[PDB]
Structure 1
Amino acid sequence: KPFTLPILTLGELTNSRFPLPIDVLYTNPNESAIVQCQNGRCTLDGELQGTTQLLPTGICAFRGKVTQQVQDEHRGTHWNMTVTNLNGTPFDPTEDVPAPLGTPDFSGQIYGVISQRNTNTVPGEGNLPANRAHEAVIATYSPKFTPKLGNIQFSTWETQDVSSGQPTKFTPVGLASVDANSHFDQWTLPSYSGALTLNMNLAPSVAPVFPGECLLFFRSFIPLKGGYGNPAIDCLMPQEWVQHLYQESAPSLSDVALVRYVNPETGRTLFEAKLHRNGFLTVARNSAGPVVAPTNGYFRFDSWVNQFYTLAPM
């Protein structure tokens, strides 16, 4: 089975860490933080890792049931939610994953909509269930965010209309805030089992080992409920690459695949990158910021090489 990448352009790709279109290719060589995201993780031979699952709709989504309302001391309202697998089967905490697949992989206040459709139906209404939906926020840094243990909290404002014991869905939309008290850090993992407990079954950290190389990201800008900022989420590979690699199941012939970013019209190679076996890109670039490239560009497999390969500078 030979190795291929999708021929989709940047304008035809979506983020694997949040439901957003890919906006630009991006580098930041001076990044201090360890890069160890858990969504959008897939080895080149098709092995999904971390909390990665195949559905674009699954990314940062939750399914479950609400158990109780609790106020915080600052008068906000919170709801305890038990969570299942996204397909509705019970989550087995002993499954060899960090948390249910699709769980958010960063610290922050994730803004979205909670919706419910009741199990019980009303004969007088055509045997049809009641429904409700509201804006909600999930603080992944909260001590009550323990998805590996099978439950989390979400907050709402000005409503009591959330039902207990009824099927509940979280649809992610963006971030509530990126101010200091909102603790947004895209590279800081949640404590999936809460404080004092170690995260387990993590996808490994990724880094360039090669001098003058840096990680290359697929970057998307994420909406905000309010306040100031222009937050971004960077993924190692787009969701469509995850879908492609998984289906392909192509054996990796070496630890590194040389790939070319090509302008199909001219046929010219704009630049080269290393696609590492664990599923990430590095380039020879010494600056931070977007990569300016024609809208018709995409990566194409060239050959299997090794760690000692020297890329041409961007």
Structure 2
Amino acid sequence: KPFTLPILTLGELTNSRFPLPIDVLYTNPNESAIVQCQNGRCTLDGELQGTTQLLPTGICAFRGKVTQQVQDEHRGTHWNMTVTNLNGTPFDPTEDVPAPLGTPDFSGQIYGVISQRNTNTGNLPANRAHEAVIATYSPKFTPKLGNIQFSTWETQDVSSGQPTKFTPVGLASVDANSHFDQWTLPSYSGALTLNMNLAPSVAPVFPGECLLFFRSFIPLKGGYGNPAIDCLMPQEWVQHLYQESAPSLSDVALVRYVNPETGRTLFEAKLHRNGFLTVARNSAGPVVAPTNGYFRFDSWVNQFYTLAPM
């Protein structure tokens, strides 16, 4: 069965690491961190890896139940919640995953809305929702152990023991004390435990090559900044590769970024078997390309193929 990519333009793609549209292609060759994100991870033959799951609505979302308000030396109001699988079934910590699928894969203050619909009931249940922040770098962020902490501006109107949803929206802050680093993984089981079942790190092997990302800009609750989240493949590629399950015939698929109005190839890239792109580019920053362009699968090559410079 032949390998294919979806025919979707940049303006028809979404980020696999946060619920955002793709804004631009992007490179950063001087990146010093190890790139090992856990969402948006899928091999070219369709094996999901890390915490990757198929629902766009599951990315950085949580489902569970608040157990109690908790004391914390930090300002604000703090709540403990158990976390289940996204479909509501209990999370099995013995499963071969780093954490419940969809768990955020980066260090930061993730901003969103906690909402609740009571189980007890004109026989209709009570509801509430409030802005909330989850600090994924905190020792209380232990989703692989089945529970996390979130905090609210609201000081009273969160109910214990009731079904709870976290809808992610953006970041609370990216200032110098906000610990935002998109390439630093959370410790899914806490500070004395090793992360397990991780999707592997990704890097260019060929000299002169760098990773190519699908970049989205992420909203902020306040403060200064222009934070972005870079994913290795958009969520629609994850979904396509999973459905097609096409055998990888070499370690590298050659792909070309095509302008369909004119038929010209703007650049070529290596699509690696583990699910990421490299290009021969010596510049950092966005790629200037029309959003009607798209990646086209051209051939299976090997790791020694020399890319045309970008």
Return the TM-score normalized by structure 2.
Answer: 0.99
* Contact kept in structure 1, 2:76 and 2:155, CA below 8 Å: no
Distance 1:91 1:74, change over 3 A: closer
* CA shift for structure 1 position 75: 3.7
* CA shift for structure 1 position 77: 1.2
* CA shift for structure 1 position 196: 1.0
* CA shift for structure 1 position 73: 2.1
| CA displacement 1:34-79 (0-9 Å, x = unmatched) | 0000000000000000000000000000000001112322442110
* Contact kept in structure 1, 2:130 and 2:154, CA below 8 Å: no
Secondary structure, aligned partner of 2:11: helix
* Contact kept in structure 1, 2:67 and 2:160, CA below 8 Å: yes
* CA shift for structure 1 position 180: 1.6
Secondary structure, aligned partner of 1:38: coil
1:131 aligned onto 2:153: no
CA distance in 1, matches of 2:57, 2:280: 34
CA distance in 1, matches of 2:305, 2:261: 27
CA distance in 2, matches of 1:8, 1:85: 30
Q: Give the count of matched residue pairs.
A: 310
| CA displacement 1:90-131 (0-9 Å, x = unmatched) | 00000000000000000000000000000111xxxx211000
* CA shift for structure 1 position 139: 0.2
CA RMSD of aligned residues (A): 0.6
- Give the match for residue 291 of structure 1: 287
CA distance in 1, matches of 2:290, 2:151: 42
* CA shift for structure 1 position 164: 0.8
CA distance in 1, matches of 2:190, 2:74: 22
* CA shift for structure 1 position 8: 0.6
CA distance in 1, matches of 2:49, 2:154: 39
Which sits farther off after the overlay, 66-75 or 178-187?
66-75
Identity of aligned residues (%): 100
Which sits farther off after the overlay, 226-235 or 289-298?
289-298
* Contact kept in structure 1, 2:132 and 2:152, CA below 8 Å: yes
Ranges in structure 1 where 5+ consecutive residues have no aligned partner: none
- Give the match for residue 144 of structure 1: 140
* CA shift for structure 1 position 296: 1.1
Secondary structure, aligned partner of 1:180: coil
* CA shift for structure 1 position 267: 1.1
- Give the match for residue 195 of structure 2: 199
| CA displacement 1:206-253 (0-9 Å, x = unmatched) | 000100000000000000000000000000000000000000000000
Ranges in structure 2 where 5+ consecutive residues have no aligned partner: none
* Contact kept in structure 1, 2:251 and 2:303, CA below 8 Å: yes
* CA shift for structure 1 position 88: 0.3
- Give the match for residue 161 of structure 1: 157
* Contact kept in structure 1, 2:5 and 2:241, CA below 8 Å: yes
